[PDB]
Amino acid sequence: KGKTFDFSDAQIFGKFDTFVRRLQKLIEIFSNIQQFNALAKHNLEGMD
Amino acid sequence: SPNLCKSGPEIKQTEDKKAMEEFKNVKIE
């Protein structure tokens, strides 16, 4: 707004995007692991 | 007579079984 003379285009293609996707994978993997633990404890009388 | 008793799990594991039924309630939830 005060420096419209020059711009630096969005260079958002860094390692942080890939590894934040990695962390999303970890989040979903482990949350579904969580829910499946209890659900398997509900499903099959053979818990072990 | 073959279905008389199992003699190991019924006797002292029965309180544990009632606790397990309460666990099945926590499971229902």
Asked if residues A41 and B27 have their Cβ atoms less than 8 Å apart, the reply is yes
Q: List the single best residue of A37, A41, A44, A45 to mutate versus B (max B Cβ within 10 A).
A: A41
Distance from C-alpha of B11 to C-alpha of B7, rounded to nearest angstrom: 6
Distances (CA, A) of A41 to A31, B9, B25: 16, 21, 12
- What is the distance in angstroms between the Cα of A26 and the nearest Cα belonging to chain B? 26
**Technique behind the model:** cryo-EM
Q: How many CB pairs under 8 A join A and B?
A: 3
Which resolution, in Å, applies to this structure?
8.0
Closest CA to A47 of B15, B27, B14, B22: B27
